[PDB]
Amino acid sequence: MNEAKGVYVMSVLPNMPAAGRLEAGDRIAAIDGQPINTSEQIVSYVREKQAGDRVRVTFIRDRKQHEAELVLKPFPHHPNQIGLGVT
């Protein structure tokens, strides 16, 4: 009720921990209780956690706040990188 302006989800991929919990159109109001105002803030967050980790993500849908359980996973493009902030 004061122009939040956070982050806009990307997509919903099958066989992923975000599927069924997070959907396209939903925004991120916070993570594990941390308020997100920048995309870079997400880079530090994932950096702290490693592959196989577990992070609680907050998102709002139609005024209905719900938490999403996402698991950090490495990427072939950058194996030395964990969670690039994808849904």
CSV table of N, CA, C and O in Angstrom, one decimal:
chain,number,residue,atom,x,y,z
A,1,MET,N,0.9,-1.2,0.0
A,1,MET,CA,0.0,0.0,0.0
A,1,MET,C,0.9,1.2,0.0
A,1,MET,O,0.5,2.3,0.6
A,2,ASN,N,2.1,1.1,-0.6
A,2,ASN,CA,3.0,2.3,-0.7
A,2,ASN,C,4.0,2.1,-1.8
A,2,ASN,O,5.2,2.4,-1.7
A,3,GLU,N,3.6,1.5,-2.9
A,3,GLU,CA,4.4,1.2,-4.1
A,3,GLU,C,5.7,0.5,-3.6
A,3,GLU,O,6.8,1.0,-3.5
A,4,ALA,N,5.5,-0.8,-3.5
A,4,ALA,CA,6.6,-1.7,-3.0
A,4,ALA,C,7.8,-1.7,-4.1
A,4,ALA,O,8.9,-1.3,-3.7
A,5,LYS,N,7.5,-2.2,-5.3
A,5,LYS,CA,8.5,-2.3,-6.3
A,5,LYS,C,9.7,-3.1,-5.9
A,5,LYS,O,10.7,-2.6,-5.4
A,6,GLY,N,9.6,-4.4,-6.1
A,6,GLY,CA,10.6,-5.4,-5.8
A,6,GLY,C,11.2,-6.1,-7.0
A,6,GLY,O,12.0,-5.5,-7.8
A,7,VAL,N,10.8,-7.3,-7.2
A,7,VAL,CA,11.3,-8.1,-8.4
A,7,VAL,C,10.2,-8.9,-9.0
A,7,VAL,O,9.3,-9.4,-8.3
A,8,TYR,N,10.2,-9.0,-10.3
A,8,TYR,CA,9.1,-9.7,-11.1
A,8,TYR,C,9.6,-11.1,-11.5
A,8,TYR,O,10.6,-11.2,-12.2
A,9,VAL,N,8.8,-12.1,-11.1
A,9,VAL,CA,9.2,-13.5,-11.5
A,9,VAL,C,9.6,-13.6,-12.9
A,9,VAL,O,9.3,-12.7,-13.7
A,10,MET,N,10.2,-14.7,-13.3
A,10,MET,CA,10.6,-15.0,-14.7
A,10,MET,C,9.7,-16.0,-15.4
A,10,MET,O,9.0,-15.6,-16.3
A,11,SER,N,9.8,-17.2,-15.0
A,11,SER,CA,9.0,-18.3,-15.6
A,11,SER,C,8.8,-19.5,-14.6
A,11,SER,O,9.4,-19.5,-13.5
A,12,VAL,N,8.0,-20.4,-15.1
A,12,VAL,CA,7.7,-21.6,-14.3
A,12,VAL,C,8.2,-22.9,-15.1
A,12,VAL,O,7.6,-23.2,-16.1
A,13,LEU,N,9.3,-23.4,-14.6
A,13,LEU,CA,9.9,-24.6,-15.3
A,13,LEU,C,9.4,-25.9,-14.7
A,13,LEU,O,9.2,-26.0,-13.5
A,14,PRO,N,9.2,-27.0,-15.5
A,14,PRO,CA,8.7,-28.3,-14.9
A,14,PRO,C,9.8,-29.0,-14.2
A,14,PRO,O,11.0,-28.8,-14.4
A,15,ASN,N,9.3,-29.9,-13.3
A,15,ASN,CA,10.3,-30.7,-12.5
A,15,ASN,C,11.2,-29.8,-11.7
A,15,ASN,O,12.4,-30.2,-11.4
A,16,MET,N,10.8,-28.7,-11.2
A,16,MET,CA,11.6,-27.7,-10.4
A,16,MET,C,10.9,-27.4,-9.1
A,16,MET,O,9.7,-27.5,-8.9
A,17,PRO,N,11.7,-27.1,-8.0
A,17,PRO,CA,11.1,-26.8,-6.7
A,17,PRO,C,10.2,-25.6,-6.6
A,17,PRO,O,9.5,-25.4,-5.7
A,18,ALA,N,10.3,-24.7,-7.7
A,18,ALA,CA,9.5,-23.5,-7.7
A,18,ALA,C,8.1,-23.8,-8.3
A,18,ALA,O,7.2,-23.1,-8.1
A,19,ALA,N,8.0,-24.9,-9.1
A,19,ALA,CA,6.8,-25.3,-9.8
A,19,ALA,C,5.8,-25.7,-8.7
A,19,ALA,O,6.1,-26.5,-7.8
A,20,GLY,N,4.5,-25.2,-8.8
A,20,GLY,CA,3.5,-25.5,-7.9
A,20,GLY,C,3.4,-24.5,-6.7
A,20,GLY,O,2.4,-24.4,-6.0
A,21,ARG,N,4.6,-23.9,-6.4
A,21,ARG,CA,4.7,-23.0,-5.3
A,21,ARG,C,4.8,-21.5,-5.8
A,21,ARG,O,4.1,-20.6,-5.3
A,22,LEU,N,5.5,-21.3,-6.9
A,22,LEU,CA,5.7,-20.0,-7.5
A,22,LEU,C,5.1,-20.0,-8.9
A,22,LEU,O,5.3,-21.0,-9.6
A,23,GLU,N,4.5,-19.0,-9.3
A,23,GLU,CA,3.9,-18.9,-10.7
A,23,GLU,C,4.3,-17.5,-11.3
A,23,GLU,O,4.6,-16.6,-10.7
A,24,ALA,N,4.2,-17.5,-12.7
A,24,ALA,CA,4.5,-16.3,-13.4
A,24,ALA,C,3.5,-15.2,-13.1
A,24,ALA,O,2.3,-15.5,-13.1
A,25,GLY,N,4.0,-14.0,-12.9
A,25,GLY,CA,3.1,-12.9,-12.5
A,25,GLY,C,3.3,-12.5,-11.1
A,25,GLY,O,3.0,-11.4,-10.7
A,26,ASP,N,3.8,-13.4,-10.2
A,26,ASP,CA,4.0,-13.2,-8.8
A,26,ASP,C,5.3,-12.5,-8.6
A,26,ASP,O,6.3,-12.7,-9.3
A,27,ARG,N,5.3,-11.6,-7.6
A,27,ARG,CA,6.5,-10.8,-7.3
A,27,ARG,C,7.1,-11.2,-5.9
A,27,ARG,O,6.4,-11.8,-5.1
A,28,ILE,N,8.4,-10.9,-5.7
A,28,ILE,CA,9.1,-11.3,-4.4
A,28,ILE,C,9.0,-10.1,-3.5
A,28,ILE,O,9.7,-9.0,-3.7
A,29,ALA,N,8.3,-10.3,-2.3
A,29,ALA,CA,8.3,-9.2,-1.3
A,29,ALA,C,9.4,-9.3,-0.3
A,29,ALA,O,9.6,-8.4,0.5
A,30,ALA,N,10.0,-10.5,-0.3
A,30,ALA,CA,11.1,-10.8,0.7
A,30,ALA,C,11.6,-12.2,0.6
A,30,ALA,O,11.0,-13.0,-0.1
A,31,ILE,N,12.8,-12.4,1.2
A,31,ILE,CA,13.4,-13.8,1.2
A,31,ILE,C,13.9,-14.1,2.6
A,31,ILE,O,14.6,-13.4,3.2
A,32,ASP,N,13.4,-15.2,3.1
A,32,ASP,CA,13.8,-15.7,4.5
A,32,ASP,C,13.6,-14.6,5.5
A,32,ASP,O,14.3,-14.6,6.6
A,33,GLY,N,12.8,-13.6,5.2
A,33,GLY,CA,12.5,-12.5,6.1
A,33,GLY,C,13.3,-11.2,5.7
A,33,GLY,O,13.1,-10.2,6.2
A,34,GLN,N,14.2,-11.4,4.7
A,34,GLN,CA,15.0,-10.2,4.2
A,34,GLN,C,14.2,-9.5,3.1
A,34,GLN,O,13.8,-10.1,2.1
A,35,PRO,N,14.1,-8.1,3.2
A,35,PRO,CA,13.4,-7.3,2.2
A,35,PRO,C,14.3,-7.1,0.9
A,35,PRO,O,15.4,-6.6,1.1
A,36,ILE,N,13.8,-7.4,-0.3
A,36,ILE,CA,14.5,-7.3,-1.5
A,36,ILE,C,14.1,-6.0,-2.3
A,36,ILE,O,12.9,-5.9,-2.7
A,37,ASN,N,15.1,-5.1,-2.5
A,37,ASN,CA,14.9,-3.9,-3.2
A,37,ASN,C,15.7,-3.8,-4.5
A,37,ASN,O,15.4,-3.1,-5.4
A,38,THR,N,16.7,-4.7,-4.6
A,38,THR,CA,17.6,-4.7,-5.8
A,38,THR,C,17.8,-6.2,-6.2
A,38,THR,O,17.7,-7.1,-5.4
A,39,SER,N,18.1,-6.3,-7.5
A,39,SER,CA,18.4,-7.7,-8.0
A,39,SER,C,19.8,-8.2,-7.5
A,39,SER,O,20.0,-9.4,-7.3
A,40,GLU,N,20.7,-7.2,-7.3
A,40,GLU,CA,22.0,-7.6,-6.8
A,40,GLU,C,21.9,-8.1,-5.4
A,40,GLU,O,22.7,-9.0,-5.0
A,41,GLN,N,20.9,-7.7,-4.6
A,41,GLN,CA,20.8,-8.2,-3.2
A,41,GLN,C,20.6,-9.7,-3.3
A,41,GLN,O,21.0,-10.4,-2.4
A,42,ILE,N,20.0,-10.2,-4.4
A,42,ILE,CA,19.7,-11.6,-4.5
A,42,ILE,C,21.0,-12.4,-4.8
A,42,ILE,O,21.1,-13.5,-4.4
A,43,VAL,N,22.0,-11.7,-5.4
A,43,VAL,CA,23.2,-12.3,-5.8
A,43,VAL,C,24.0,-12.7,-4.5
A,43,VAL,O,24.7,-13.7,-4.4
A,44,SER,N,24.0,-11.8,-3.6
A,44,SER,CA,24.7,-12.0,-2.3
A,44,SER,C,24.1,-13.1,-1.5
A,44,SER,O,24.7,-13.9,-0.9
A,45,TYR,N,22.7,-13.1,-1.5
A,45,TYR,CA,22.0,-14.1,-0.8
A,45,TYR,C,22.3,-15.5,-1.2
A,45,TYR,O,22.8,-16.3,-0.4
A,46,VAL,N,22.2,-15.7,-2.5
A,46,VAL,CA,22.6,-17.0,-3.1
A,46,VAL,C,24.0,-17.4,-2.8
A,46,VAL,O,24.4,-18.5,-2.6
A,47,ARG,N,24.9,-16.4,-2.9
A,47,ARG,CA,26.3,-16.6,-2.6
A,47,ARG,C,26.5,-17.2,-1.3
A,47,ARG,O,27.4,-18.1,-1.1
A,48,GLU,N,25.8,-16.7,-0.3
A,48,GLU,CA,26.0,-17.2,1.1
A,48,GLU,C,25.6,-18.7,1.1
A,48,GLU,O,26.3,-19.5,1.8
A,49,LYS,N,24.5,-19.1,0.4
A,49,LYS,CA,24.1,-20.5,0.4
A,49,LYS,C,24.8,-21.2,-0.7
A,49,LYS,O,25.2,-20.6,-1.7
A,50,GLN,N,24.9,-22.6,-0.6
A,50,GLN,CA,25.5,-23.4,-1.6
A,50,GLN,C,24.5,-24.4,-2.2
A,50,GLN,O,23.3,-24.3,-1.9
A,51,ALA,N,25.0,-25.2,-3.1
A,51,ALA,CA,24.1,-26.2,-3.8
A,51,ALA,C,23.5,-27.2,-2.7
A,51,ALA,O,24.3,-27.6,-1.9
A,52,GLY,N,22.3,-27.5,-2.9
A,52,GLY,CA,21.6,-28.5,-2.0
A,52,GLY,C,21.0,-27.7,-0.8
A,52,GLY,O,20.5,-28.3,0.1
A,53,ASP,N,21.2,-26.4,-0.7
A,53,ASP,CA,20.7,-25.6,0.4
A,53,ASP,C,19.2,-25.5,0.3
A,53,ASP,O,18.5,-26.0,-0.6
A,54,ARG,N,18.6,-24.8,1.3
A,54,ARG,CA,17.2,-24.6,1.3
A,54,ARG,C,16.9,-23.1,1.8
A,54,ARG,O,17.4,-22.7,2.8
A,55,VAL,N,16.1,-22.4,1.0
A,55,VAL,CA,15.8,-21.0,1.3
A,55,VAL,C,14.3,-20.7,1.1
A,55,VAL,O,13.7,-21.1,0.2
A,56,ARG,N,13.8,-20.0,2.1
A,56,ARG,CA,12.4,-19.6,2.2
A,56,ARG,C,12.2,-18.3,1.4
A,56,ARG,O,12.9,-17.3,1.8
A,57,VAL,N,11.4,-18.3,0.4
A,57,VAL,CA,11.1,-17.1,-0.4
A,57,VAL,C,9.7,-16.7,-0.2
A,57,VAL,O,8.7,-17.4,-0.4
A,58,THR,N,9.5,-15.4,0.0
A,58,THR,CA,8.1,-14.8,0.2
A,58,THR,C,7.7,-14.1,-1.1
A,58,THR,O,8.4,-13.4,-1.7
A,59,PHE,N,6.4,-14.4,-1.5
A,59,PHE,CA,5.9,-13.7,-2.7
A,59,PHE,C,4.4,-13.5,-2.5
A,59,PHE,O,3.7,-14.1,-1.7
A,60,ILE,N,3.8,-12.4,-3.1
A,60,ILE,CA,2.4,-12.0,-3.0
A,60,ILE,C,1.7,-12.3,-4.3
A,60,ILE,O,2.1,-12.0,-5.4
A,61,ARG,N,0.5,-12.9,-4.1
A,61,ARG,CA,-0.4,-13.2,-5.3
A,61,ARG,C,-1.8,-12.8,-5.0
A,61,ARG,O,-2.4,-13.3,-4.0
A,62,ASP,N,-2.4,-11.9,-5.8
A,62,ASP,CA,-3.8,-11.4,-5.6
A,62,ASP,C,-4.0,-11.0,-4.1
A,62,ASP,O,-5.0,-11.3,-3.5
A,63,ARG,N,-3.0,-10.3,-3.5
A,63,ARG,CA,-3.1,-9.9,-2.1
A,63,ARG,C,-3.0,-11.1,-1.1
A,63,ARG,O,-3.3,-10.9,0.0
A,64,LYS,N,-2.6,-12.2,-1.6
A,64,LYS,CA,-2.4,-13.4,-0.8
A,64,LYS,C,-0.9,-13.8,-0.6
A,64,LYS,O,-0.3,-14.4,-1.5
A,65,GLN,N,-0.4,-13.4,0.5
A,65,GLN,CA,1.0,-13.6,0.8
A,65,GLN,C,1.3,-15.1,1.1
A,65,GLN,O,0.6,-15.7,2.0
A,66,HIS,N,2.3,-15.7,0.4
A,66,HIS,CA,2.6,-17.1,0.6
A,66,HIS,C,4.1,-17.3,0.4
A,66,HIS,O,4.7,-16.7,-0.5
A,67,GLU,N,4.7,-18.2,1.2
A,67,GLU,CA,6.1,-18.5,1.2
A,67,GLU,C,6.3,-19.7,0.2
A,67,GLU,O,5.5,-20.6,0.1
A,68,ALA,N,7.5,-19.7,-0.4
A,68,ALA,CA,7.9,-20.7,-1.4
A,68,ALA,C,9.2,-21.3,-1.0
A,68,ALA,O,10.2,-20.6,-0.7
A,69,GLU,N,9.3,-22.7,-1.0
A,69,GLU,CA,10.5,-23.4,-0.6
A,69,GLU,C,11.3,-23.7,-1.9
A,69,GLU,O,10.9,-24.6,-2.6
A,70,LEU,N,12.4,-23.0,-2.0
A,70,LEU,CA,13.3,-23.2,-3.2
A,70,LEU,C,14.6,-23.8,-2.7
A,70,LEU,O,15.1,-23.5,-1.6
A,71,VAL,N,15.2,-24.6,-3.6
A,71,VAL,CA,16.5,-25.3,-3.3
A,71,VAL,C,17.5,-24.8,-4.3
A,71,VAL,O,17.3,-24.8,-5.5
A,72,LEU,N,18.7,-24.4,-3.8
A,72,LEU,CA,19.8,-23.9,-4.6
A,72,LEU,C,20.3,-25.1,-5.5
A,72,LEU,O,20.6,-26.2,-5.0
A,73,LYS,N,20.5,-24.8,-6.8
A,73,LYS,CA,21.1,-25.8,-7.7
A,73,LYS,C,22.1,-25.1,-8.7
A,73,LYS,O,21.9,-24.0,-9.1
A,74,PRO,N,23.2,-25.8,-9.0
A,74,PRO,CA,24.2,-25.2,-9.9
A,74,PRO,C,23.8,-25.3,-11.4
A,74,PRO,O,22.8,-26.0,-11.7
A,75,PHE,N,24.4,-24.5,-12.2
A,75,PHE,CA,24.1,-24.4,-13.7
A,75,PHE,C,25.3,-24.8,-14.5
A,75,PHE,O,26.4,-24.5,-14.2
A,76,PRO,N,25.0,-25.4,-15.7
A,76,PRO,CA,26.2,-25.8,-16.6
A,76,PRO,C,26.9,-24.6,-17.2
A,76,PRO,O,28.1,-24.7,-17.5
A,77,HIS,N,26.2,-23.5,-17.3
A,77,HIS,CA,26.8,-22.3,-17.9
A,77,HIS,C,27.8,-21.7,-16.9
A,77,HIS,O,28.8,-21.1,-17.3
A,78,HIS,N,27.5,-21.9,-15.6
A,78,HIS,CA,28.4,-21.4,-14.6
A,78,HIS,C,28.3,-22.3,-13.4
A,78,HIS,O,27.7,-22.0,-12.4
A,79,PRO,N,29.0,-23.5,-13.5
A,79,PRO,CA,29.0,-24.5,-12.3
A,79,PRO,C,29.5,-23.9,-11.0
A,79,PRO,O,29.1,-24.3,-9.9
A,80,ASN,N,30.4,-22.9,-11.2
A,80,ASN,CA,31.0,-22.2,-10.0
A,80,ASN,C,30.0,-21.1,-9.5
A,80,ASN,O,30.4,-20.2,-8.7
A,81,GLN,N,28.8,-21.2,-9.9
A,81,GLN,CA,27.8,-20.2,-9.4
A,81,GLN,C,26.5,-20.9,-9.0
A,81,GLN,O,26.1,-21.9,-9.6
A,82,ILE,N,25.9,-20.5,-7.9
A,82,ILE,CA,24.7,-21.1,-7.3
A,82,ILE,C,23.5,-20.1,-7.3
A,82,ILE,O,23.7,-19.0,-6.9
A,83,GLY,N,22.4,-20.5,-7.8
A,83,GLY,CA,21.2,-19.7,-7.8
A,83,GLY,C,21.5,-18.3,-8.4
A,83,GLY,O,22.1,-17.5,-7.8
A,84,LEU,N,21.0,-18.1,-9.6
A,84,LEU,CA,21.2,-16.8,-10.3
A,84,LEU,C,19.9,-16.0,-10.1
A,84,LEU,O,19.8,-14.9,-10.6
A,85,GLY,N,19.0,-16.5,-9.4
A,85,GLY,CA,17.7,-15.9,-9.1
A,85,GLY,C,16.7,-16.2,-10.1
A,85,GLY,O,16.0,-15.4,-10.6
A,86,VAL,N,16.5,-17.5,-10.4
A,86,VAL,CA,15.5,-18.0,-11.4
A,86,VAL,C,14.4,-18.8,-10.6
A,86,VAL,O,14.6,-19.4,-9.6
A,87,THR,N,13.2,-18.7,-11.2
A,87,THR,CA,12.1,-19.4,-10.6
A,87,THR,C,11.8,-20.7,-11.3
A,87,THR,O,11.1,-20.7,-12.3
